[PDB]
């Protein structure tokens, strides 16, 4: 019939916060920013309705629906003279695409002591599905008002409207009283965030100078060592943990068997150790650098906050799935600090996602199966608040065995009263306090390091034939090292370690940016895994 045109303004001079939204700006162009929490399914919205009159069964079309259901006023045929009786026929109508995004305030915009504010943004036209939960997006559009009947009972004189009863010619109950209570909503004509698996499409849409530096970084010889030195520059001296974090942020490949075992290639890491050993400063570094990374604490989390919940905004309203921490970090990292403090039920809930990389919620009439493809970087404290060197890793941790199995690497960090090490940690802490960023000297800035990781995540590493046999030999060597009699390993070795080794080798191959897994990569993965085990 007719093409509907979407004018999409962008690049506004200023960006507003959710709490900077005021009623003076209703029906005006402006830009806001916020973190997406919930997105609606795209739904059809009546744009140009068609109406049939009960008297004159003609068809009046192109009845513009501006913002609400609006019947026409005059019939096409002059004889009918009807205005109030019409029927909407849906096929003969026109519709647009509508999505309602819910956006919370950004974590850096919430004031002191206040709670985050939420706003309902309306995406229309081609901007639907451009925002997904977890992403911080800025929207440009109209600040509008929508009816809000929940303002009943609120203090103040709520506005109301009455029909004018003068000039009406009574003869000697026609109330027509409505409630003019509204709430501020947003109608976005432009969304930008503030499928990449193919390598060539990723390199094609990328600036030439960045290609210059990326290929220089690939041409570098100690690229692995430089990458490790560029991970968490503020932390001093934990290099095995930085190696593990880099490999986790790179990741392996996802492999599905014939019958669908669906082997997962996400490295899960646990960091345990003595107090004040920088364990939470590595989780702090990962969130804020790794894309789609979600940080949470053990005691401030629930099974419905980590996995998806079934919530209800309005009593008498339906139920919805608001996405959990394990889904806002999808294809990313969930940094759970103080894993030990977390309750047993929450641990079982996280176990349900570590086994199948999926979460099943069957509560309230919603039976959805959500997928949670996330790597879990956990920080934990041993029981008693201090690591026991003469006790196994399992005896040190209250963490349940089903959870403990899915962790590929266990980095145990212990502090000691070493004269030189203490003198040098203290110099770094005080120089990190005196200077702000001059005390941090990483080989790569966060920008180009993130670019390199984004590039290296596009590879499918393959191991050559000699790599298979050496993997077998290294697994044999690990098994021989374990159960020796005097080694007394913290946690014992099984075929889960062998799978950990394969995915670690794939991550190392991604780090070196090669599609073939050299046996030296398997050797490096074997060393990294073996040094993680601590002898009792």
């Amino acid at each position: 019939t007719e093409r509907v045109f979407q004018i999409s303004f962008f690049n506004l001079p200023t960006v507003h916060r959710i709490r900077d939204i005021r009623s003076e700006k209703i029906g005006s162009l402006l830009s806001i920013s916020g973190t997406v929490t919930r997105t609606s399914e795209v739904r059809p919205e009546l744009y140009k309705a068609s109406f049939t009159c009960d008297m004159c069964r003609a068809i009046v079309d192109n009845v513009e629906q501006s913002f609400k259901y609006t019947e026409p006023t005059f019939c096409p045929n002059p004889s009918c003279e009807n205005r109030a009786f019409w029927t909407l026929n849906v096929t003969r109508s026109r519709f647009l695409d509508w999505q309602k995004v819910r956006i919370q305030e950004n974590a850096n915009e919430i004031p002191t002591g206040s709670m985050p504010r939420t706003l309902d943004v309306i995406l229309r036209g081609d901007s639907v599905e451009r925002a997904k939960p977890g992403d911080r997006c800025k929207f440009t559009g109209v600040e509008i008002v929508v009816p809000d009947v929940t303002q009943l009972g609120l203090p103040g004189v709520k506005p109301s409207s009455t029909l004018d009863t003068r000039g009406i010619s009574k003869t000697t109950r026609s109330l027509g009283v409505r409630d003019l209570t509204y709430k501020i909503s947003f109608l976005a004509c432009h969304v930008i965030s503030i499928n990449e698996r193919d390598q060539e499409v990723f390199l094609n849409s990328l600036s030439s100078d960045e290609i210059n530096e990326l290929k220089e970084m690939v041409k570098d010889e100690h690229i692995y060592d430089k990458l490790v030195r560029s991970i968490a520059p503020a932390v001093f001296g934990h290099e095995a943990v930085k190696k593990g974090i880099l490999l986790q942020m790179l990741g392996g490949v996802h492999k599905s068997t014939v019958e669908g075992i669906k082997l997962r290639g996400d490295i899960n890491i646990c960091v345990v150790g003595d107090p004040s050993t920088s364990k939470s400063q590595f989780l702090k570094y990962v969130v804020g650098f790794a894309p789609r990374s979600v940080y949470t604490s053990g005691k401030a989390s629930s099974a419905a906050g980590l996995t998806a919940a079934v919530v209800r905004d309005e009593e008498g309203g339906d139920y919805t799935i608001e996405a959990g921490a394990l889904m806002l970090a999808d294809n990313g990292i969930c940094c759970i600090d103080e894993f030990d403090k977390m309750d047993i039920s929450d641990q079982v809930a996280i176990h349900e996602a570590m086994e199948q990389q999926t979460i099943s919620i069957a509560k309230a009439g919603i039976h959805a199966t959500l997928n949670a493809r996330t790597s879990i970087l956990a920080a934990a404290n041993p029981v008693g608040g201090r690591y026991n060197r003469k006790l196994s890793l399992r005896g040190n941790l209250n963490m349940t065995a089903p959870i403990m199995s899915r962790f590929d690497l266990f980095f145990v960090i212990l502090d000691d009263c070493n004269e030189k090490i203490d003198t040098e940690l203290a110099s770094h802490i005080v120089d990190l306090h005196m200077k702000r960023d001059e005390a941090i000297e990483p080989p790569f800035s966060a920008e180009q390091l993130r670019r390199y990781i984004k590039y290296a995540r596009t590879f499918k590493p393959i191991l050559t034939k000699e790599a298979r046999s050496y993997l077998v030999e290294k697994y044999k060597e690990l098994r021989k090292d374990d159960a020796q009699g005097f080694s007394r390993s913290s946690y014992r070795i099984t075929v889960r370690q062998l799978e950990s080794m394969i995915r670690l080798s794939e991550a190392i191959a991604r780090a070196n940016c090669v599609d073939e897994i050299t046996p030296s990569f398997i050797a490096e993965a074997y060393d990294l895994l073996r040094q993680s085990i601590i002898r009792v």
């Binding site: 399914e41 795209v42 739904r43 059809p44 919205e45 309705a49 629906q65 609400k68 259901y69 096929t91 519709f95 695409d97 509508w98 309602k100 599905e129 997904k132 977890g134 992403d135 929508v146 009816p147 499928n195 492999k255 068997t257 014939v258 019958e259 082997l263 789609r292 309005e314 996405a323 889904m327 999808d330 294809n331 079982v348 176990h351 349900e352 099943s360 039976h367 959805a368 959500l370 997928n371 493809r373 065995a401 089903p402 199995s405 499918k460 393959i462 298979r468 077998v472 697994y475 044999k476 098994r479 021989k480 374990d482 014992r492 099984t494 075929v495 889960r496 062998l498 799978e499 394969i502």
Partner: protein, 629 residues
């Protein structure tokens, strides 16, 4: 003028295709031309595919015609385009066309079925539930997804006869469809316009079902939540897609008409399904397949073939696979005179260290077993292991949920984490293994459900690793009463051998190599599954007194070497487990009597399980006491 041709059908004199198709001059042309299409189209070999489909429909009394979209598109492209354009006016003309075509071959067919439903298949455009927009409204789409919920089966008005409350007159049939309910205001006998009531007794109804179709979690892009739609199944597709099934729904994408909660005139959408099919009965067999079963059974060494067939991605664990096969085939329940009862199920426990593949041998049993229910001591609570009367908070009505042991009444219950269970689950499992029933007195319901299930449990030792120096009773959390009920105990420990570890790692790296996303004598699975179902359904073996002597002596020997050791009691329960496993061994051979070799194998399995559950000091019975068996 008033009659058109296929060439002139393309030129549309109306604003949209709906008015074009509704136009009678075009409607009769379309009806005639679809009548021609059903008759003439034939396959490249010569077979008239619609001919054979009509004969099958007539010979099976079905009301569904499986019309393809290749044949329509290749033969009459404009009509296939019209069908993809406005599939509501079409599939209404063509359902009549199919009725005429099936009445020509099968006269007097309207008395059986009122109308023939047409199932369009092989639609080219396959959409995703996140890709559906307003441009697909009132059109024919083909989505794919997993079924997540089904809302019963409800009657829906199809041929409504309305009773007049002034005369008592039953007004004739008025066709009601899925758009909206119909109403009648004109009488004939008294011409009243007053209250007119649908007559339920004389009205005709069609089946109606709502199925929630949710995007397959694998296909969802990262960071996005799976999207769902409501699919309406009408009068022939009801109860064909269970929850958890991945299906391809071809249907009409339309608006569910009923706005102020959103502040915008927003409509919900539904997919009225035309044809629903699983994208990819199972345990059923034919006469030829039954003959194949009966012939392959006669081959010697069949028992070992079945044992090796189980778990074909699980390395070694040959005793575990033997026990799994024995439990899968099972024994036979026995009642002496209604006075003494013996279970005919083989309960198998798998006591293993971590990474011993115990879960995988459970998922494989769920793979292969008919009527198999999987439960866990803790974790995903798909089933609760305990029967309860629970009031559903949304549908307002109570439901009596039988436990996981009730659902698998005649099959297998697979429990993972049997070491860790609640006292309620422990009591339920214990009393359903002792009595083979579940007694419940809750919310006014006092009943004893049947739980004649074979239990396969997977446990982890008490502490983390098996201790050979300690007996099995104190190596695991569960205690004497529950361990006694297990016919077979498969104890598997994480060994320290060079060769076994090398070959397990060779197997795992080969499987990893095979599974890469790039191109980088066991009985076949489905044949074995049908074989197991047939053996369970049809084969009820027996013994004869000729094989009494040896068994009695063996029992005595078992006893005397056991009290000399004194570590584990072997009671009459062990003799009755030997008998059950002998029945299972005969069952896997399709035999009707139990041979002495089956008894020898059952004795070997029982003594091996009992010996491997002992201490190293008590294990002598293997080297020099029971080496004869």
């Amino acid at each position: 003028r008033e009659e058109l041709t296929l060439e002139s059908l393309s030129n549309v004199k109306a604003n949209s295709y709906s008015e074009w198709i509704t136009q009678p001059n075009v409607s009769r042309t379309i009806a005639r031309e679809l009548k021609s299409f059903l008759l003439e189209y034939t396959d490249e070999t010569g077979r008239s595919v619609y001919g054979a489909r009509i004969r099958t429909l007539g010979e099976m009394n079905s009301e569904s015609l499986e019309v393809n979209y290749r044949h329509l598109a290749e033969s009459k492209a404009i009509l296939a385009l019209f069908l993809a354009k406005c599939p509501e006016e079409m599939l209404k003309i063509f359902d009549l066309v199919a009725m005429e075509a099936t009445e020509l071959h099968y006269p007097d067919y309207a008395r059986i079925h009122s109308e023939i439903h047409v199932r369009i298949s092989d639609f080219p455009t396959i959409y995703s539930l996140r890709e559906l927009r307003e441009s697909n409204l009132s059109s024919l789409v083909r989505v794919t997804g997993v079924v997540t919920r089904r809302t019963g089966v409800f009657p829906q008005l199809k041929y409504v006869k309305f009773n007049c409350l002034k005369c008592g007159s039953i007004l004739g049939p008025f066709f009601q469809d899925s758009n909206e309910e119909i109403r009648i205001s004109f009488c004939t006998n008294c011409k009243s316009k007053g209250p007119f009531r649908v007559n339920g007794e004389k009205t005709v109804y069609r089946n109606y079902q709502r199925v929630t179709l949710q995007e397959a979690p694998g296909t969802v892009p990262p960071g996005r939540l799976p999207r769902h739609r409501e699919v309406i199944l009408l009068a022939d597709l009801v109860d064909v897609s269970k929850p958890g099934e991945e299906v391809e729904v071809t249907g009409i994408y339309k608006n569910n008409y009923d706005n102020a909660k959103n502040g915008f005139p927003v409509f919900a959408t539904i997919i009225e399904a035309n044809s629903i099919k699983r994208r990819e009965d199972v345990f059923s067999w034919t006469e030829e397949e039954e003959r194949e079963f009966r012939k392959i059974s006669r081959d010697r060494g069949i028992i070992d073939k079945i044992i090796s067939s189980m778990a074909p991605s699980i390395y070694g664990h040959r005793d575990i696979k033997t026990a799994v096969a024995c439990s899968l085939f099972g024994g036979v329940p026995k009642n002496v005179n209604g006075k003494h009862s013996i279970r005919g199920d083989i309960n198998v426990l798998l006591l293993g260290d971590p990474g011993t593949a115990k879960s995988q041998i459970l998922k494989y049993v769920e793979k292969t077993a008919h009527r198999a229910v999987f439960a866990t001591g803790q974790g995903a609570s798909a089933v609760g292991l305990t029967a309860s009367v629970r009031k559903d908070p949304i549908t307002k009505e109570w439901t009596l949920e039988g436990g996981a042991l009730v659902l698998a009444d005649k099959g297998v219950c697979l429990i993972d984490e049997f070491d860790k269970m609640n006292d309620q689950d422990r009591t339920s499992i214990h009393e359903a293994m002792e009595q083979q029933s579940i007694s419940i007195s809750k919310a006014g319901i006092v009943t004893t459900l049947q739980a004649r299930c074979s239990i396969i449990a997977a446990a982890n030792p008490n502490g983390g690793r098996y201790n050979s120096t300690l007996p099995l009773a104190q190596n695991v959390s569960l205690t004497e009463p529950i361990l006694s009920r297990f016919d077979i105990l498969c104890v598997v420990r994480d060994l320290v051998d060079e060769e076994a570890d090398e070959r397990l790692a060779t197997f795992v790296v080969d499987s990893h190599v095979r599974s890469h996303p790039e191109n980088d004598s066991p009985i076949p699975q489905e044949l074995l599954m049908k074989y197991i179902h047939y053996a369970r359904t049809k084969i009820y073996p027996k013994l004869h007194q000729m094989d009494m002597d040896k068994v009695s002596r063996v029992y005595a020997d078992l006893r005397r070497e056991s009290i000399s050791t004194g570590s584990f009691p072997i009671t009459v329960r062990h003799l009755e487990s030997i008998l059950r496993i002998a029945e299972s061994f005969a069952k896997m051979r399709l035999s009707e009597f139990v041979s002495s070799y089956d008894l020898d194998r059952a004795i070997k399995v029982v003594v091996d399980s009992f010996v491997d559950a002992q201490k190293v000091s008590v294990r002598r019975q293997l080297r020099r006491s029971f080496a004869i068996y």
